[PDB]
């Protein structure tokens, strides 16, 4: 039996009051990831670049656990500019099907006032593996 | 056995990286719905009208699956004006009990900066059926 | 068998379209709590004081049910000032381990535009008890 707690060597890492992710068993969940630039360690200005890195981090954790984005049941993403979603949404959906994730997980994205680390976007989705 | 994926002919419909809703089986979940005006296809200015339509869409999906709002375990709603919640909250609670939903599902509403489609409100709640 | 619904005599109490909390059984969930000052009934200006009270309310409900913060699988908290998180995060993590909550539940905090009751912060986390 297992419950939450998900270690990995790709995500932003956990060193505070939270872990990289949580594996409840059969139903996984990813914390509010962020485009922690691999060279700046924060959030690339390139809404597309930062948007792509954030997706890799969220998947890296779920992948290190033994799953895939395709399994993602639901997904949530906070944006600092709903006008930029045009590029993120176009690439967000184009990658899922390009990764074999046509299931299309639930969505819950909204324009928040701000985000941790001044990040221009956050990612938090759920995944299953029945 | 089932997992996520919920089709319907009432909700805003899914044509991107997400589905109308997701049925994990026994525990359903609705995506961030929106008052997609049946005549404008976006969000009626009438905070009350748009607030009512949004509730119907969220219920239409759960209803098309085989459940009811009364079963809703938790609920989340983003507002663009916490001052308007006075009318939404008054009608939100008056409809639940009027629909046989006295259980009172969890709440998680907050004043967000913006919302998809420039909608003045979003709805995302969970439902059970043990 | 049980499903949602969690009564208590410590939390902000439920008198509208939502209950104090919801106990799905084995997997609990707390609604968007708030620092409802015990003397003002709203939200203390002391970001630290209000931040501490909010934590007690969220735990009071889960405690009245038969669990602890340590069991918390995931956690979400809306802030009105990401600059204040420096004090909340420092005390948030210092209390978990001080309460025996080193598990570190998932995180999902963001700077929202506003919050119910003009509260300067909201709390909503999940808990397990397998």
From Swiss-Prot, chains A, B, C:
Q: Which GO terms describe its molecular function?
A: deaminase activity
Which Gene3D superfamilies is this protein grouped with? RutC-like (3.30.1330.40)
The entry's active site is: 109
Its GO CC terms are:
cytosol
Q: Which InterPro entries match?
A: RidA, RidA_CS, RutC-like_sf, YjgF/YER057c/UK114
> Could you name the domain of life of the organism this protein comes from?
Bacteria
All disulfide bonds of the chain are: none
Oligomeric and partner information:
Homotrimer.
Family matches, as NCBIfam families: Rid family detoxifying hydrolase (TIGR00004)
Q: Please state which protein family the record places this protein in.
A: Belongs to the RutC family.
Mind telling me what this protein is named?
RutC family protein HI_0719
Instruction: Tell me what organism the protein belongs to.
Output: Haemophilus influenzae (strain ATCC 51907 / DSM 11121 / KW20 / Rd)
